[PDB]
Design a protein around this ligand. Sequence first.
Ligand code: HEC
Ligand code: HEC
Ligand code: HEC
Ligand code: HEC
Ligand code: HEC
Ligand code: HEC
Ligand code: HEC
Ligand code: HEC
Ligand code: HEC
Ligand code: HEC
Ligand SMILES: [Ca+2]
Ligand SMILES: [Ca+2]
Lengths: 473, 473
Amino acid sequence: GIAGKEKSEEWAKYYPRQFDSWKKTKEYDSFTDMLAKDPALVIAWSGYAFSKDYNSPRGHYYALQDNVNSLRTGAPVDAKTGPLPTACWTCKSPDVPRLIEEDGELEYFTGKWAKYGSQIVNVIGCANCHDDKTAELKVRVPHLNRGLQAAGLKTFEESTHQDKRTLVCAQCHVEYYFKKTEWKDAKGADKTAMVVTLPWANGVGKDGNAGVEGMIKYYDEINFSDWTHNISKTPMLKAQHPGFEFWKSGIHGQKGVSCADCHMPYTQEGSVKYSDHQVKENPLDSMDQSCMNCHRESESKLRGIVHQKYERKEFLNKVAFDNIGKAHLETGKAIEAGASDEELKEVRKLIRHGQFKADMAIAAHGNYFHAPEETLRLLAAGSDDAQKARLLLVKILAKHGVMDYIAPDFDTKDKAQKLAKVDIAALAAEKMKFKQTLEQEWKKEAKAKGRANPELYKDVDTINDGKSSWNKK
Amino acid sequence: GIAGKEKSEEWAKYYPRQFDSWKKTKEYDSFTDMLAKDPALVIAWSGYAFSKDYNSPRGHYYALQDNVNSLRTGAPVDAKTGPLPTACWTCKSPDVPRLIEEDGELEYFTGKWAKYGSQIVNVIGCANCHDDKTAELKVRVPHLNRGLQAAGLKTFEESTHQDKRTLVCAQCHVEYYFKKTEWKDAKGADKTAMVVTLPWANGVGKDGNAGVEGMIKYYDEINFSDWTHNISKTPMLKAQHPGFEFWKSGIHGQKGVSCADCHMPYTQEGSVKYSDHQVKENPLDSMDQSCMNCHRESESKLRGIVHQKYERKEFLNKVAFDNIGKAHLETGKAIEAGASDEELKEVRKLIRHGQFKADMAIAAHGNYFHAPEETLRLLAAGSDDAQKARLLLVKILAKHGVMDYIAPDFDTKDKAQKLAKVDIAALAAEKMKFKQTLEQEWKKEAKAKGRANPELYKDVDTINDGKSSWNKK
Ligand code: HEC
Ligand code: HEC
Ligand code: HEC
Ligand code: HEC
Ligand code: HEC
Ligand code: HEC
Ligand code: HEC
Ligand code: HEC
Ligand code: HEC
Ligand code: HEC
Ligand SMILES: [Ca+2]
Ligand SMILES: [Ca+2]
């Protein structure tokens, strides 16, 4: 066994090669401000946290700190304030399964994100994927098995080794929602938990289908919405990195090539063979071990073939979100023009469904390569749903005496956030205050109670490197 | 050499195995009436021959007879009548390169289809793909090299052996248009030819791109249109089986897997290994021969994987053509309501472009599998172009006093053909009359002049087998 299991440093003496390679994800220190790259996204997520801050993923090394640095988590004053719940910690630290094991799952999912600010202090580590006694692959978060069984699939424990080499990634790289769960503790006090739940009841990655249509069917049946759009007033569904669901629909997934085969290639230093734990941000940069063992041709040729896929996805991504953004703005105009909720009934259903399809397609960044067919198909479907809604809107507008309406420009993050009612300067000030106050208090208490050793990872908070999405001071 | 090489039966004595397997395409005797299956196609091609008769492909054995049987070729009464030109024989017979070599290319392309009715009497044969003296692969139709060179690709003769195994198919399975060409013969007479031309000036199959965008650029630049849509009055572009262009864009094409690898798989009879000349209508039905030499997988699983691709394509196909169909009808309503050509300029450009993208995606039946990515992307693009045009149309219609217009239904061949101004009962009557008179007179002369031996292929005309698209009783 390993004492202080959540502290990956502790494993280093037993497994130096895995520890050293694991820490190398520190090298993946760059992310792209997606709201600045594709401002239409701000309009799509208007009224939601994602319209504030949303960057591409970077090294696992920065997972915990980026979750803290993001405008999405806001600026809490204490453990009872802040916009987001405890569930936001779930896929960022080994301290998560620890707390679930100690205090219970429901208790872990009860309260504000700030509640565990001092408890959840170690980044995605060894304990998130391995047993401390045997080092065998292991998943300690109960949401995964719950989703697998809902999808009619085997639990992690009933799966094969190759299945697990993928499932230890799926414990986080999946689509989910927060299920409001009412419960009662030991003392008999009624509480409310927001439980990470995978909407897999209708299956995922089944015969080439990512599972999006089934998810929509499920979400509508339980009448769930992540938020109400602040422009169109549409009950919306947010998609989040459905890496596993899409991977399962793609050819590699259908052929049994695990995430680990491409992202954690086997390697050999001297006479010792081991798995490279620097989860590769871009396997195309390590083609020799990530691909060429199964593919026989030039690396430049294969990298070129993959780039064509990125171009195709980008082409449909732009079309879909431009249509979706206009659909929201035009719905806002219709409301202003006097259109009733009943009149907007069908329009809203199509915007909800369409954006979810399009969002799911782009929410897992590797989708364009892992699952090009479902990705292109869903961007096509989401775009069409939006266009279908826009055709109804032109008629509704005309009926209300509005002709030739043209939605405003949302071609820059600034213009879009203005339309979304987001004051980034204010949020940045409030967020910077938090980081200089409460956050440092968290790291102070954590070090004092031996919960973490932040001195070993000082280069983790890069908020001031001049590459921040919101801290442009 | 081989005298009367246009008569494939003359090659039997030298290459019996290739001849007997070539004849077995006779077994692929079924086609699907695509206008009955997807009546939206009738609206799409309204004002053009394809709105009358369009079936899926069937055995090479039936190519010439199906060309003669189609309502598209009409009912000529003599050598100077009939709706179509000589170019329609071009990819149906070995007598084609014979006529080009004897009479010259421009002369072969000058005149009505009926002009060569008693000369083009042998179906796709050995001579279409082989030199009669050496049996080496050979292409004798100049349009291919002309297209290849236009696309910056090597000529057939300069291509590799593996390239040639694809090019002997590309001589016919490609997109083309008729180029009105003014010329003067040896005796000083001025003539006009309609030359088969591949619109490849902007390249085809380049880095994952089928080449549709470049073709639109080309066609627009030369102000060419295949026909003026009779409902929307849009100058339209018709796509025709761009098998090679799409194949080149897919993974198999990019990896050098030729059409012949899957469609003319090697076979072993006793100690003789040769190419199976029964060009496989559905290679999935001969997986062991057509795929397992490169893939190690269960037949049901591989077939299931490919079927997924068909479902994805069918999903986007229906969406694109329903939007395109409604766009044409709504444009027709706009014309009736009083919209000018100036008011409809952008609407028509979008319809022309959108339909061409969608049509190219579905025009080569195997595209869904050969090139799933470009197929899905182009159907998405085509559908979007149609939706953009429809958004403009609601506004145009409203400005002309038309509110909430609902296009008529086109869910059955009968309904759509009526909207298309196609009197199939009448067309069928005159076609049958042509078949019973002139066609038979063509057959008589052919046998008498020793140009063909029709008795050897008595089962080729299946117009009365009960599965004709138009000959219904
Ligand atoms: C509560 C609603 C959450 C907040 C706030 C954040 N997450 Fe996550 N998260 C997960 C993965 C697999 C990734 C990487 C893949 C990807 O980003 O597409 C992320 C990444 C982040 C990031 C960095 C990127 C960004 O700027 O958006 C932030 C700031 C972040 N997450 C905040 C996985 C999970 C997960 C597992 C099931 C859950 C429940 C959440 N994340 C919840 C939140
Ligand atoms: C989950 C996302 C992981 C994290 C974080 C870490 N490891 Fe890991 N490890 C993971 C996989 C998918 C694999 C391959 C399993 C296989 O046998 O194919 C590994 C493997 C190991 C092993 C076994 C030997 C080897 O292949 O290298 C060890 C000793 C091991 N991992 C240790 C280890 C340590 C110490 C970590 C923290 C620094 C760590 N792993 C994180 C998945 C994941
Ligand atoms: C090889 C066949 C792979 C398999 C199996 C999986 N991934 Fe992958 N992944 C691969 C590539 C070539 C790429 C594209 C890289 C690029 O920069 O273009 C990806 C990308 C990702 C990403 C996005 C990383 C980022 O944007 O920073 C993630 C999050 C990712 N992959 C996750 C992942 C998971 C969880 C997998 C199994 C379910 C998986 N990948 C499989 C190649 C391969
Ligand atoms: C939850 C605890 C996770 C597990 C287990 C795995 N990933 Fe992950 N991943 C997660 C987050 C929160 C992030 C973003 C971190 C940030 O600061 O932005 C990521 C990121 C990636 C990336 C890109 C960066 C990198 O380290 O290469 C990839 C390619 C990726 N994740 C792949 C991946 C695979 C293949 C996994 C299993 C072996 C895996 N991740 C597990 C959260 C979690
Ligand atoms: C073996 C374990 C593999 C590894 C690692 C990678 N790929 Fe792969 N790939 C594999 C299979 C079995 C297949 C299916 C075809 C078959 O032989 O049955 C594929 C297919 C591809 C494709 C074609 C599909 C497409 O989207 O166009 C591509 C372009 C491809 N693979 C790329 C690729 C890359 C870039 C990899 C490394 C990051 C990679 N593969 C790894 C098996 C394996
Ligand atoms: C080669 C460059 C061609 C020219 C010129 C024309 N056709 Fe063709 N035709 C060609 C192929 C490769 C195929 C099979 C693939 C497919 O998608 O159909 C065909 C098929 C036909 C058919 C049968 C199917 C059908 O449409 O009902 C007919 C009746 C046919 N072709 C007629 C036809 C006419 C009338 C032509 C002049 C406009 C013509 N073809 C030209 C290849 C080529
Ligand atoms: C083009 C559409 C073809 C038609 C019509 C016929 N043949 Fe063919 N043949 C074709 C290809 C692509 C190949 C393979 C060439 C290679 O080298 O890989 C062949 C091959 C032959 C051969 C060589 C031996 C063999 O591989 O079987 C012979 C002797 C041959 N073909 C004869 C032949 C005859 C007699 C045909 C008419 C009945 C005939 N072929 C038609 C392409 C085409
Ligand atoms: C294997 C990798 C193939 C290659 C290379 C090419 N084709 Fe193909 N083709 C293949 C399959 C599996 C299918 C689908 C069959 C089905 O019934 O779904 C096809 C289909 C065609 C078709 C359509 C046939 C019909 O509908 O009757 C045609 C006309 C066709 N293929 C032509 C063709 C050409 C000319 C190719 C090279 C340019 C080519 N195929 C390559 C598998 C393979
Ligand atoms: C023109 C002279 C052609 C050449 C050379 C090749 N094909 Fe063809 N193909 C052509 C026609 C006009 C038709 C339709 C015939 C009808 O009566 O409907 C076809 C059809 C096919 C099919 C389906 C039927 C079959 O025999 O399998 C396929 C799969 C197909 N063609 C593939 C193909 C390949 C791979 C070729 C090169 C070896 C090839 N065709 C050459 C016209 C012509
Ligand atoms: C060897 C000459 C091949 C033949 C015959 C067929 N396939 Fe193939 N296939 C081959 C390669 C080189 C690749 C690309 C991946 C790589 O190893 O580099 C592929 C890829 C596929 C795929 C994946 C792409 C996709 O659309 O999902 C599938 C599903 C596939 N091949 C199917 C397939 C079938 C059904 C075949 C016979 C009709 C077939 N291939 C023949 C090489 C070869
Ligand atoms: Ca979600
Ligand atoms: Ca054409």
